[PDB]
Design an enzyme around this catalytic site. Structure first.
Site, PDB file in Angstrom:
ATOM      1  N   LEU F  42     -23.922  41.647  20.147  1.00 34.83           N
ATOM      2  CA  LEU F  42     -22.952  42.140  21.112  1.00 34.83           C
ATOM      3  C   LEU F  42     -22.878  43.658  21.092  1.00 34.83           C
ATOM      4  O   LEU F  42     -23.139  44.309  20.076  1.00 34.83           O
ATOM      5  CB  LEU F  42     -21.573  41.543  20.833  1.00 34.83           C
ATOM      6  CG  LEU F  42     -21.433  40.054  21.146  1.00 34.83           C
ATOM      7  CD1 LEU F  42     -20.107  39.518  20.644  1.00 34.83           C
ATOM      8  CD2 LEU F  42     -21.557  39.844  22.646  1.00 34.83           C
ATOM      9  N   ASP F  43     -22.532  44.211  22.248  1.00 39.19           N
ATOM     10  CA  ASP F  43     -22.356  45.644  22.396  1.00 39.19           C
ATOM     11  C   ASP F  43     -21.349  46.159  21.374  1.00 39.19           C
ATOM     12  O   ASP F  43     -20.336  45.511  21.096  1.00 39.19           O
ATOM     13  CB  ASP F  43     -21.884  45.942  23.820  1.00 39.19           C
ATOM     14  CG  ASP F  43     -21.808  47.409  24.120  1.00 39.19           C
ATOM     15  OD1 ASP F  43     -22.263  48.203  23.281  1.00 39.19           O
ATOM     16  OD2 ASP F  43     -21.281  47.764  25.195  1.00 39.19           O
ATOM     17  N   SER F  44     -21.647  47.319  20.784  1.00 43.15           N
ATOM     18  CA  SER F  44     -20.681  47.922  19.872  1.00 43.15           C
ATOM     19  C   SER F  44     -19.444  48.362  20.638  1.00 43.15           C
ATOM     20  O   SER F  44     -18.313  48.215  20.158  1.00 43.15           O
ATOM     21  CB  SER F  44     -21.300  49.103  19.125  1.00 43.15           C
ATOM     22  OG  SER F  44     -21.446  50.251  19.943  1.00 43.15           O
ATOM     23  N   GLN F  47     -17.584  45.397  20.666  1.00 44.30           N
ATOM     24  CA  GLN F  47     -16.746  45.098  19.508  1.00 44.30           C
ATOM     25  C   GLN F  47     -15.487  45.940  19.546  1.00 44.30           C
ATOM     26  O   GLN F  47     -14.441  45.521  19.043  1.00 44.30           O
ATOM     27  CB  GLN F  47     -17.453  45.332  18.169  1.00 44.30           C
ATOM     28  CG  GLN F  47     -17.491  46.775  17.680  1.00 44.30           C
ATOM     29  CD  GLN F  47     -18.037  46.905  16.266  1.00 44.30           C
ATOM     30  OE1 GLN F  47     -18.725  46.015  15.768  1.00 44.30           O
ATOM     31  NE2 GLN F  47     -17.715  48.011  15.608  1.00 44.30           N
TER      32      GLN F  47
END
Ligand SMILES: CCCCCCCCCCCCCCCCCC(=O)OC[C@H](COP(=O)([O-])OCC(O)COP(=O)([O-])OC[C@@H](COC(=O)CCCCCCCCCCCCCCCCC)OC(=O)CCCCCCCCCCCCCCCCC)OC(=O)CCCCCCCCCCCCCCCCC
Ligand SMILES: CCCCCCCCCCCCCCCCCC(=O)OC[C@H](COP(=O)([O-])OCC(O)COP(=O)([O-])OC[C@@H](COC(=O)CCCCCCCCCCCCCCCCC)OC(=O)CCCCCCCCCCCCCCCCC)OC(=O)CCCCCCCCCCCCCCCCC
Lengths: 599, 459, 171, 143, 112, 88, 86, 166
Positions: F42-44, F47
């Site tokens: 997942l994209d930081s 997050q």
């Protein structure tokens, strides 16, 4: 007649508790807070009898008890002044505090300090009672600074949280400026009237009351929240909810104008006085209308609303209608005390966010609190026909007419309207949309303490303003002949702002990115930060000038020790040479026979 | 009066000859037993000031101040212990002896009829204090602030003797009774200038007016707590007292001569009241407070309305107990953590939950709370000064607001807002601390019932 | 049982109760019951304390002060006469103080009695008030902290002379 | 102990700047900080050589346990802490608006222009020629 | 106040400011951070003693060379002060006048 | 009162629950150990979104510096566990 | 830093403390506060002002009953006095 | 300080102010989605200076999006809590001395507490050794506290076992 001696009983019925709160030091652990509550009710019925006795026969008897010192030409004792201001007020105070104390038994049950808390809050009540029952102006002063410092402690209930105690300190500060005004009024009354005795000042009416009564204007503006000094309320929210409730309803901020009402025969005249009145209470109405909107802490909305009210009451001391105001103080106490004591149900029921954002809809396991919010909201709107109507509508009728400088009429209109739009705000947010807020509903309405509290306060409220309605022995000629367009605008303005704000926050389209400049001036272009921060720096500047007088003082004393440094040169003027002091003392000694030759 | 002079003089050998560990018991005991008869001293009645003996007498004002002194010894001495509570016996008996002898010369001074006996006993009062604070003052560098402190006194404090002796041989008797009834008006000119200025500034050095107020702060931070309660509860009231009496003469002079000093005290009240707001190091705050209230006193003295005196003396006593106590709070906080700096520790509402009540109560009594004697005196003074100038209330009540602000600021940030948690030393309270606090406040709150004792000669 | 004509109590003028409509008796239940509950249970005690006092009487006297030559017959100095004069001057002074207290209280009780009539029936008493307080105002008012006789006699000299010039300009 | 040098007197030129870096913050701009103390000092204004700093907000943000508000750190105290903490403002962008308030006072002075002028009682107002106003004026007669 | 310009930090200022700054910091953090058992009294940190001693006005007693100093202090206690001298003497003398002549309309004044 | 505490079972059920409500990844692999990025990639920034809306679930704290490095779910449960008052 | 072990605890080193609090609490709180507070509570009439009330009452009653205006000002009868002359 | 937390912070508090903007949460949604795209087109370029530039542009354009009363959840510094209870936190070094009577009021607590007193009285030598060993000269570079390798406590523990919030 001595049942009014039972009226001076009830005050000691209140006195009783703190004595229990000290001497025994155990059975208080038995839940005295219940006991305090019972003492309050005993004071409510035992305080209810004298009201009845008055409202048949009148008969107000002032008692001096035993006199306080003597001094020179003026023996000031102490008193309990039954004015029908005291007679009518004190059952209201005891009643609202009955509510707030039971509610508090619900609110603080977790706090380990509860007992001490009731010691304070009760003591605060004692300071109020002793203020509103007093005539002799020194006893006024006593209750004055008493309720003041009690505001400091109670708003400062939470040690730590620098915000809290800071707010407390700002509050007591403003109280103290109100004090400078007050003791100005006192001093003038001495020198000119050779007393402060609230009977004697009434008897001999000063031709020139200008300066002292102005002082009274200042003293009123200090506590009452009035203009030029705002920041009292919005940071005064930092105290625990019940204290805030009791703070804006029956005590303090009303006790500011309660003094002006107390002196009303002296403010009958000097139209300079009424001028300033409606020059100012106006400014708080529309000002707090302009700076009140959009700030999203429910408790804070309630605050600014009480400020606007207080403005309207200052305007009611404008013209001459002091009684109408007085009634509006009592009614206001009921209504806004209701409003807070419900808002706590919202807050604590929610966990605590106390922001109008998030919140939710009206009925979600919250039937009775929301009912209280449209009784209290719909109430404080100015009422359609309900109780407080007996205050506010009459107020704007008489004020709507005769010699008002007429900048105050529009003031009244848009003022009350924006009050209605406060109500529309708290409904369109707290009571309207489907629930949006931190999940895991903890909400509980089930407990006899709340339902009984809000219960009694609303059952009373709708029936209390009706007793106060036509038991008000007529003090003047009501307008009662009210022209078209000067009659039909009371309710009508509440509907024009009702509808207007309704369509403002209803059917809102996309809201993103920019907002107006007014919304940034609706929070404010600082009247809080400019005066608090600015006025905070100046005393430090005076500390720099103090470093000027101190550094110049020890710089001048350092010019004496510099004169002792180079006075050692007056000792060091000795060259320590035997060919110097010997032969120079011989030559200048022959100059002692030269000066002694001619001397 | 002599019945009050012997028992303390006998209280000296009580100290000197005694078994070790009983010195505090014996001294405290018999000293309170003195305080009883100090309370006997009130017969004062009607018009004529009672006269015990042709050497020294008492009017009202001397009686409240005296009662305050003889009351103050046992509490003082009671407080001074545990500042040391370790030493050779000679240090203890020397110190208690010195407090005694100091009290003796104080009683001499307040009771003294004749102003030269007043003056001799005056500097004779100053010496014992000096020995106290200098010989052990905790001595931060010592500042040498006892000795050239005595030079701050004598520098301009000597010539008042000159002026006196002048008054002596011109009019004969310096008895105060006969200086009264023989007082004759003195016109405004340059000789009466240097005279009035002599006596005035001579006493005005003691209660610091804003010009000279650098006198107090150092001397009072270097003082051991006994020397502090000596100093600011009493040794200013000597200056203001003698001022009260010698203003008998100087009748027209004090107008044209008064005005500049009045100005300086009305402005310096505000200035000092300001500088005491922003400082650190708590021990100074109460000092400059004393400077403020004393400035208010001087303001009260120069304007001669009787109201001015009633409020004045009331302020002498009330400020005596209040300032004294509040010092003793600063000390009781100092033994806990060795600082003297206010901001260092905090909290103490959590911890020491009782000591709160004494902080609060005392600070309020310095907040000018309405029934408190401090507000009786301050109030009447404000009445007098408003009678003198309709304008001055801006400055006065502005002192009301500032005195409120710092007086209530001290109540916080020492006592509230957080525990600094790197402390872990403070030991909860004591019984002695509660004894000291109580012995201060309880009378100050009771006097708020029957004040007519402490209001001045004119009443 | 204070001296009556010093402290007037006007006619009590109590109105006659008229029920005028048939309803309950809200206070009168409790004015009778109160007069049952709190009247006698105290009254017995006060009366018992009375007889207890009365079995052994005391007599205490209001002191007197004779008169003296006051300030006039005293020589410029030699205090031995002066002391009497000026101190009793101080006594009579405080006496006048309490006179001012008495009048000043009559006015207050007057307004409280009248009710809304404030300027009706207090005119006489307020009048004599302005009389007395103008006398005190004229005589003792402005002297200072230190005042004995010499200063009151002084001020009286001042007024006598100012009014003697005023009465030469009366011509 | 209280060391021989706990503070103060500046003015020695070459190595005193670094000496003041010691006992205080020491770095490039911190050598320029102890130096900024002697630069702000200049001619003696009663300020000793204690280091300097600014008024910017270092405030509570949840980590690092910043200066004397809640002190876990032992670095310099600047001159501020007698101002900031309990009651102060210190730094922000701020609105800095002196108009809006003074333009409510515009509302006030607008009123005082309404002060000599008036609203009247009944029924309505400002047809005005030299019309009546309350004092009831001329004559009296009917018949 | 108002964080702005979003400084690029360059290279030196990065290395120097970072390494040296947090260097000294962490040195002193860990320094007072010891927090062992067995200390009964205060932690005593030499910080804020410098605060106290300097704020006790170390340069107060020495001297005050002229520069602008005597102007800032003298004019700092000059304008308002001496003018207040003049106003209280003014209103004083006026009060005395309206007492000695005409009327101040004191009527009953008494306690004064 | 505000009675109910957040216990370990509860908070587990919560982080677990809302992460199962996240649509763009499936309930397929969700476990306290199951890696909060490396597993799901997942994209930081995403997050940052997870910690955003999860904070808005529990409504408190979570400073940016500590929120940066959180990752695995058990860890998030841990941070909420010491910050809140949790253990028996 | 000497503190105490706080075996019980009080003013001074052990076993004399109880006596210390006994003498200071007794002679300090008991005798002077309560006793003295009763003494000066009601002592004989102070400054004579009660007598002033009685005397005032009598004298005023006389002044009205005999018709003289009360409080004549003039603290000394101009009948006996002399005035300087220009 | 790195580009990471810079960008990510601006994103986060941007969402915060956006929360405070709207109401009913859906409009907040798809607006926040348009923003999600506004940063979603970003990040795919490793060009250096262009990026920080455009970011700063989002720093002004963001600074426009601040209304003065952004929503503040209670527990952080803000108008709701931030230690409402702070007068209730009493450090465990207090109660080290109560009266032995009240020390007997709750007989079994101080048992385990005594096991702690011995736990960390036996300790701190292991601690000082491990720390004095690990620290590079001056310990300048590390604000952290690395664990203990041998079986036992983590060395600078004492304050980190705290009086808990209420
Ligand atoms: C009303 C009349 C008009 C008043 C006008 C002003 C109103 C506001 C006043 C300021 C705020 C007062 C307050 O509550 O402060 C908090 C303060 C302390 O509260 P706290 O520290 O928060 O809680 C106590 C601890 O937490 C835990 O301790 P505790 O719970 O175990 O014990 C509590 C209690 C235990 O008691 C004792 O320790 C025994 C005291 C024996 C006194 C013997 C004489 O007190 C103490 O322990 C220490 C405080 C008492 C010191 C001595 C008396 C000070 C009186 C202060 C003024 C009166 C305020 C309330 C008046 C109510 C009407 C009577 O409480 C008081 O001051 C109340 C004192 C009650 C005891 C005496 C009652 C009768 C006294 C005679 C009449 C007094 C009239 C005074 C007139 C005004 C003078 C300035
Ligand atoms: C642990 C509990 C602590 C309680 C603290 C107090 C709480 C407040 C409620 C107190 C209720 C009981 C009061 C005493 C009983 C007698 C009352 C009575 O009959 O009054 C009418 C009764 C009237 O009869 P009378 O002889 O015809 O009238 C004389 C005038 O009142 C003479 O005219 P006056 O102008 O002197 O007026 C008297 C006035 C004013 O008195 C003062 O201001 C005295 C000032 C002394 C200054 C000393 C400075 C030392 C350095 O004082 C009072 O009204 C009493 C308040 C002060 C009590 C002080 C207690 C010790 C601390 O009053 C008196 O006789 C006054 C009595 C003398 C004062 C001291 C009395 C108290 C002795 C210690 C009792 C401690 C409390 C006991 C426990 C209570 C709860 C379980």
């Amino acid at each position: 007649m001595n049942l009014f001696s039972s009226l001076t009983l009830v005050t000691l019925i209140l006195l009783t508790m703190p004595i229990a709160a000290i001497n025994f030091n155990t059975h208080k652990f038995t839940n005295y807070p219940l006991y305090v509550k019972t003492t309050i009710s005993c004071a409510f019925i035992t305080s209810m009898i004298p009201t009845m006795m008055f409202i048949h026969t009148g008969q107000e008897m002032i008692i001096s008890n035993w006199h306080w010192l003597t001094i020179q030409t003026l023996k000031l004792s102490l008193s309990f002044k039954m004015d029908f201001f005291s007679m009518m007020f004190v059952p209201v105070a005891l009643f609202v505090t009955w509510s707030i104390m039971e509610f508090s038994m619900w609110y603080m049950h977790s706090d380990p300090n509860i007992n001490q808390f009731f010691k304070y809050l009760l003591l605060f009540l004692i300071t109020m009672l002793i203020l509103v029952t007093a005539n002799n102006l020194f006893q006024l002063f006593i209750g004055w600074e008493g309720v003041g410092i009690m505001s400091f402690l109670l708003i400062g209930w939470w040690y730590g949280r620098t915000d809290a105690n800071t707010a407390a300190l700002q509050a007591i500060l403003y109280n103290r400026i109100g004090d400078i005004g007050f003791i100005l009024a006192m001093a003038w009354f001495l020198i000119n009237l050779n007393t402060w005795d609230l009977q004697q000042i009434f008897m001999l009416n000063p031709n020139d009351s200008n300066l002292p009564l102005m002082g009274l204007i200042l003293a009123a503006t200090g506590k009452s929240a009035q203009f030029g000094l705002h920041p009292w309320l919005p940071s005064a929210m930092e105290g625990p909810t019940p204290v805030s409730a009791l703070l804006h309803s029956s005590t303090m901020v009303v006790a500011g104008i309660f003094l002006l009402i107390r002196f009303y025969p002296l403010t009958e005249n000097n139209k300079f006085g009424q001028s300033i009145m409606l020059c100012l209470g106006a400014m708080t109405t529309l000002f707090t209308a302009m700076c009140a909107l959009t700030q999203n802490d429910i408790k804070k909305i309630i605050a600014f609303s009480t400020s606007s009210q207080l403005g309207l009451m200052m305007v009611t001391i404008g013209i001459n209608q002091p009684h109408l105001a007085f009634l509006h103080i009592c009614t206001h106490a009921f209504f806004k005390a209701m409003l807070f004591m419900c808002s706590g149900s919202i807050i604590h029921s929610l966990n605590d966010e106390q922001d109008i954002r998030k919140m939710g809809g009206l009925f979600k396991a919250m039937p009775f609190t929301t009912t209280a919010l449209i009784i209290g909201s719909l109430a404080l709107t100015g009422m359609p026909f309900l109780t407080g109507f007996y205050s506010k509508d009459l107020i704007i009728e008489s004020a709507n007419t005769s010699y008002t400088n007429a900048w105050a009429l529009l003031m009244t209109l848009v003022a009350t309207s924006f009050t209605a739009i406060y109500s529309t705000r708290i409904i369109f947010f707290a009571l309207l949309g489907q629930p949006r807020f931190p999940t895991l509903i903890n909400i509980n309405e089930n407990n006899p303490f709340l339902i009984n509290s809000i219960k009694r306060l609303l059952i009373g409220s709708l029936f209390a303003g009706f007793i106060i309605s036509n038991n008000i022995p007529p003090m003047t000629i009501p307008q009662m002949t009210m022209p078209h367009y000067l009659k039909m605008t009371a309710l009508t303005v509440t509907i024009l702002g009702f509808i207007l704000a309704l369509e403002i926050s209803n059917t809102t389209h996309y809201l993103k990115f920019n907002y107006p400049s007014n919304t940034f001036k609706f929070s404010n272009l600082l009247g809080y930060y400019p005066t608090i921060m600015h006025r905070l720096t100046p005393y430090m500047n005076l500390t720099m000038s103090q470093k000027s007088a101190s550094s110049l003082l020890d710089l001048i004393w350092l010019e004496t020790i510099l004169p002792k440094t180079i006075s050692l040169a007056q000792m060091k003027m000795s060259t320590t040479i035997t060919s110097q002091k010997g032969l120079i003392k011989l030559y200048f000694l022959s100059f002692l026979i030269t000066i002694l030759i001619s001397t | 009066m002599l019945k009050y002079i012997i028992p303390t003089m006998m209280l000296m050998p009580l100290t000197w000859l005694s078994k070790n560990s009983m010195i505090w018991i014996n001294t405290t005991l018999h000293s309170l037993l003195i305080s009883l008869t100090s309370l006997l001293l009130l017969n004062q009645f009607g018009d004529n000031s009672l006269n015990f003996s042709l050497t020294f007498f008492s009017d009202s004002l001397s009686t409240p101040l005296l009662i305050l002194t003889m009351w103050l010894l046992p509490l003082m001495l009671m407080a001074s212990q545990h500042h040391l509570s370790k030493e050779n016996l000679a240090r203890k008996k020397l110190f208690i002896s010195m407090l005694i002898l100091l009290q003796l010369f104080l009683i001499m001074t307040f009771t003294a009829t004749e102003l030269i006996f007043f003056y001799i006993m005056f500097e004779a009062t100053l010496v014992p204090t000096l020995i106290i604070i200098t010989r052990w003052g905790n001595q931060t560098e010592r500042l040498n602030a006892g000795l050239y402190f005595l030079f701050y006194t004598l520098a301009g404090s000597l010539p008042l003797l000159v002026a006196l002796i002048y008054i002596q041989n011109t009019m004969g008797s310096l008895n105060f009774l006969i200086l009264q009834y023989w007082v004759q008006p003195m016109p405004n000119s340059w000789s009466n200038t240097f005279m009035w200025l002599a006596c005035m500034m001579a006493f005005m050095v003691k209660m610091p007016l804003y010009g000279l107020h650098l006198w107090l702060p150092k001397a009072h931070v270097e003082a051991p707590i006994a020397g502090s309660m000596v100093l600011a509860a009493i040794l200013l009231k000597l200056g203001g007292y003698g001022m009260m009496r010698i203003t008998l003469l100087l009748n027209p002079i004090t107008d044209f001569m008064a005005y500049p000093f009045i100005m300086l005290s009305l402005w310096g009240m505000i200035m000092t009241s300001s500088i005491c707001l922003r400082q650190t190091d708590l021990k100074s705050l109460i000092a400059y407070s004393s400077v403020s209230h004393m400035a208010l006193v001087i303001v009260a003295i120069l304007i001669q309305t009787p109201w001015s005196y009633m409020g004045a003396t009331a302020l002498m006593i009330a400020h005596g107990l209040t300032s004294s106590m509040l010092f003793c709070l600063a000390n009781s906080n100092y033994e806990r953590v060795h600082s003297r700096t206010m901001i260092l520790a905090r909290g103490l509402q959590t911890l020491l939950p009782l000591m709160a009540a004494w902080w609060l109560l005392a600070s309020l009594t310095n907040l000018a709370l309405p029934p408190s004697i401090n507000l009786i005196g301050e109030l009447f003074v404000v009445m007098s000064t408003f009678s003198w100038s309709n304008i001055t209330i801006i400055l006065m009540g502005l002192n009301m607001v500032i005195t409120a602000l710092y007086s209530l600021y001290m109540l916080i940030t020492t006592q509230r807002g957080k525990h600094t948690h790197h402390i872990n030393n403070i030991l909860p309270s004591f019984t002695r601390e509660n004894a000291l606090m109580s012995l201060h406040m309880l009378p100050l709150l009771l006097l708020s019932l029957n004040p007519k004792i402490i209001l001045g000669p004119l009443y | 049982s204070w001296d009556k004509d010093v402290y007037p109590e006007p006619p009590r003028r109590t109105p006659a109760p008229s029920p005028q409509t048939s309803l309950p008796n809200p206070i009168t239940y409790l004015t009778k019951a109160f007069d049952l509950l709190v009247d006698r249970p105290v009254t017995l005690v006060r009366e018992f304390i009375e007889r207890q006092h009365a079995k052994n009487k005391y007599y205490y006297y209001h002191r007197e002060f004779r008169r003296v030559p006051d300030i006039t017959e005293c020589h410029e100095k030699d205090v031995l006469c002066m002391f009497e004069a000026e101190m009793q001057w101080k006594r009579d002074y405080k006496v006048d103080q309490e006179i001012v207290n008495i009048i000043q209280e009559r006015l207050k009780a007057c307004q409280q009695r009248e009710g809304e009539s404030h300027r009706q029936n207090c005119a006489k008493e307020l009048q004599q008030f302005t009389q007395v307080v103008k006398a005190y105002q004229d005589r003792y008012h402005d002297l200072g902290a230190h005042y004995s006789a010499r200063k009151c006699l002084a001020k009286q000299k001042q007024r006598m002379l100012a009014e003697r010039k005023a009465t030469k300009e009366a011509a | 102990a209280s060391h021989i040098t706990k503070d103060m007197l500046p003015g020695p030129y070459p190595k005193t700047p670094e000496e003041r870096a010691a006992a205080a913050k020491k770095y490039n701009m911190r050598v320029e900080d102890y130096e900024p103390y002697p630069d702000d000092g200049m001619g003696y204004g009663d300020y000793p050589k204690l280091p300097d700093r600014s008024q910017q907000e270092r405030d509570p943000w949840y980590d690092w346990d910043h200066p004397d508000l809640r002190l876990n750190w032992g670095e310099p105290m600047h001159w501020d802490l007698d101002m900031y903490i309990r009651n102060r403002v210190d730094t922000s962008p701020t609105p800095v608006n002196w108009n809006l308030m003074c333009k409510h006072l515009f509302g006030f002075v607008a009123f005082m222009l309404f002060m000599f002028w008036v609203g009247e009682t009944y029924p309505t107002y400002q047809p005005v020629g030299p019309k009546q106003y309350p004092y009831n004026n001329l004559y009296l007669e009917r018949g | 106040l108002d964080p702005a310009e979003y400084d690029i930090s360059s290279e030196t200022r990065k290395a120097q400011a970072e390494r040296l700054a947090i260097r000294s910091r962490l040195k002193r953090e860990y320094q007072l951070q010891y927090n062992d058992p067995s200390r009964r009294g205060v932690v005593e940190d030499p910080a804020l003693i410098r605060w106290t001693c300097a704020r006790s006005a170390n340069v107060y007693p020495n001297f005050r060379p002229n520069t602008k100093t005597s102007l800032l202090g003298a004019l700092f206690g000059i304008g308002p002060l001496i003018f207040w001298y003049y106003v209280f003497k003014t209103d004083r003398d006026r009060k005395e006048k309206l007492i000695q002549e005409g009327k101040l309309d004191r009527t009953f004044n008494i306690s004064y | 009162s505000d009675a109910p505490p957040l216990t370990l079972e509860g908070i587990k059920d919560r982080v677990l629950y809302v992460l199962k409500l996240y649509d763009k990844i499936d309930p397929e692999k969700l476990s306290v150990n199951s890696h909060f990025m490396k597993d799901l990639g997942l994209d930081s920034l995403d997050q940052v979104e997870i910690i955003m809306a999860m904070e808005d679930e529990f409504g408190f704290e979570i400073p940016d510096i500590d929120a940066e490095k959180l990752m695995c779910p058990q860890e998030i449960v841990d941070y909420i566990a010491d910050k809140k008052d949790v253990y028996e | 830093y000497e503190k105490n072990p706080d075996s019980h605890g009080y003013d001074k080193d052990p076993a004399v403390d109880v006596w210390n609090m006994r003498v200071v609490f007794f002679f300090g709180f008991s005798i002077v506060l309560v006793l003295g507070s009763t003494f000066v509570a009601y002592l004989p009439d102070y400054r004579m002002q009660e007598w002033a009330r009685r005397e005032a009452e009598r004298l005023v009653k006389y002044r009205e009953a005999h018709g003289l205006p009360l409080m004549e000002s003039n603290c000394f009868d101009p009948s006996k006095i002399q005035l300087p002359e220009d | 300080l790195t580009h990471q937390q810079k960008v990510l912070q601006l994103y986060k508090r941007a969402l915060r102010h956006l929360e405070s903007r709207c109401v009913h949460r859906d409009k907040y949604r798809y607006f926040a989605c348009l923003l999600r795209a506004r940063f979603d087109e970003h990040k795919n370029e490793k060009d250096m200076v262009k990026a920080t530039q455009l970011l700063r542009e989002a720093e002004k354009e963001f600074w426009h999006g601040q209304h003065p009363q952004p929503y503040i959840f209670p527990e952080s510094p803000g108008g709701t809590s931030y230690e409402r209870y702070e007068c209730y936190k009493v450090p465990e070094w207090c109660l080290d001395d109560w009266h032995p009577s009240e020390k007997a009021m709750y007989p079994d607590y101080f048992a385990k507490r005594e096991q702690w007193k011995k736990l960390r009285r036996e300790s701190w030598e292991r601690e000082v050794k491990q720390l004095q060993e690990e620290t590079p000269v001056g310990g300048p570079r590390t604000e952290a506290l690395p664990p203990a390798r041998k079986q036992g406590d983590l060395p600078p523990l004492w304050w980190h076992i705290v009086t808990r919030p209420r």
